[PDB]
Design an enzyme around this catalytic site. Structure first.
Site, PDB file in Angstrom:
ATOM      1  CG  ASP A  20      -9.783   4.253   2.500  1.00 15.98           C
ATOM      2  OD1 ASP A  20     -10.134   4.830   1.409  1.00 15.98           O
ATOM      3  OD2 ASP A  20      -8.758   3.535   2.616  1.00 15.98           O
ATOM      4  CE  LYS A  42      -1.566  -2.144   7.125  1.00 14.20           C
ATOM      5  NZ  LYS A  42      -2.973  -1.749   7.178  1.00 14.20           N
ATOM      6  N   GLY A  69       0.846  -1.167   0.000  1.00 19.01           N
ATOM      7  CA  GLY A  69       0.000   0.000   0.000  1.00 19.01           C
ATOM      8  C   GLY A  69       0.888   1.226   0.000  1.00 19.01           C
ATOM      9  CB  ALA A 104       1.739  -1.293   5.265  1.00 21.04           C
ATOM     10  CE  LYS A 105       9.185  -2.959   3.859  1.00 23.13           C
ATOM     11  NZ  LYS A 105      10.527  -3.564   3.921  1.00 23.13           N
ATOM     12  CB  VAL A 106       0.948  -6.816   3.170  1.00 21.74           C
ATOM     13  CG1 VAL A 106       0.160  -7.930   3.792  1.00 21.74           C
ATOM     14  CG2 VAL A 106       0.458  -5.448   3.621  1.00 21.74           C
TER      15      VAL A 106
END
Ligand code: ANP
Length: 312
Positions: free
Chosen positions: A128, A39, A19, A22-24
């Site tokens: 959101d 996350k 996102g 964050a990298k997941v």
């Protein structure tokens, strides 16, 4: 380095998501063998959007809300361990199907309504809501995922939220979403940011020829530019269109709230660790969201899936 800590409890796999914050990564919880999604946030480069998401998720416990298992802060990272949803984003599921029949849209949308409505029941507004933020679990049920903006994309944003004039704005959003499920494109869009505003403020959009009149009325009640004329959350639960083929309102209450600690689960842990049951019991009730909480919760996920409660 910051990874030294996490690598104690999890085996890391491939990034499955990026996102803006964050990298997941797909990971496996070593002790229980369960797949999880983690996350990962750089504390340096970004804001306390994180404090919000974690405060929120520790308070929201629901069949359509993604479960939080473990938070670990490092010298530089915050790492959040979540329920892994192998189904993919709902956005991706529209793309392939082009758009969904109304029957399937009902099935899906009733789950969004369940989640959002329960969210509001706890006093928050998601803020959101959009397809990229609903994921399919292993049962093919939806889980809502992204709570950085929980309160106690511009194409989804309600006109009064654009204006700074919270809950009604979730209805708006859920309205933009229902539109997306049924027609497979956005009610309002534009290369130009302010042109897309104008569109949202006018509230006039294309009505495709495959929508049933029930559909089209629904959209029109949710997509009221004026919040005060917008269908409220309460009559969305039992709207005629919502109830078609079901004939009860949306079941939005938690089917799995926290009542007692699990009988069976406390036991497999005080057995595995060779620890007095009662200290094991007492320490779980600290709800720290440490590796102890994690292991406990992930063993409930074993129970809910009808798997043995066992540790390897
Ligand atoms: N529980 C999960 N299971 C499987 N995949 C996930 C899970 N959580 C996140 N992902 C994947 O990774 C993406 C990024 O997660 P998300 O919470 O939206 O990131 P974020 O940067 O904090 N917020 P955003 O800028 O709104 O994307 C998601 O859209 C998913 O595709």
């Amino acid at each position: 380095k910051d990874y030294d800590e996490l690598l104690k409890y999890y085996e890391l796999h491939e990034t499955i998501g990026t996102g803006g914050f964050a990298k997941v990564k797909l990971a496996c919880h070593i002790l229980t063998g369960e797949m999880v999604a983690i996350k990962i946030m750089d504390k340096n480069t970004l804001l306390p959007r994180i404090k919000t998401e974690i405060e929120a998720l520790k308070n929201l416990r629901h069949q359509h809300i993604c479960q939080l298992y473990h938070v670990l802060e490092t010298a530089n990272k915050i790492f959040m361990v979540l329920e892994y949803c192998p189904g993919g984003e709902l956005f991706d599921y529209i793309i392939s199907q082009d758009r969904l029949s109304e029957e399937e849209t009902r099935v899906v949308f009733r789950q969004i309504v369940s989640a959002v409505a329960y969210v509001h029941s706890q006093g928050y507004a998601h803020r959101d809501l959009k397809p990229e933020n609903l994921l399919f679990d292993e049962y093919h049920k939806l889980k809502l995922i992204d709570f950085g903006l929980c309160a106690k994309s511009l194409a989804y944003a309600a006109p009064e939220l654009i204006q700074g004039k919270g809950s009604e704005a979730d209805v708006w959003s859920m309205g933009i979403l229902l539109y997306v499920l049924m027609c497979g494109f956005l009610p309002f869009d534009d290369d130009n940011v302010m042109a897309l505003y104008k569109k949202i403020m006018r509230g006039k959009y294309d009505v495709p020829k495959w929508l049933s009149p029930s559909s089209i009325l629904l959209l029109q009640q949710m997509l009221q530019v004026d919040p005060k004329k917008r269908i409220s959350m309460k009559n969305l639960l039992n709207h005629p269109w919502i109830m078609q083929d079901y004939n009860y309102p949306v079941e939005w209450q938690s089917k799995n709230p926290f009542i007692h600690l699990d009988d069976d689960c406390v036991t497999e842990l005080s057995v595995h660790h060779r620890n007095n049951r009662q200290t094991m019991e007492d320490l779980i009730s600290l709800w720290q969201y440490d590796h102890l909480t994690a292991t406990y919760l992930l063993l409930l996920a074993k129970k809910a899936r009808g798997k043995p409660v066992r540790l390897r």
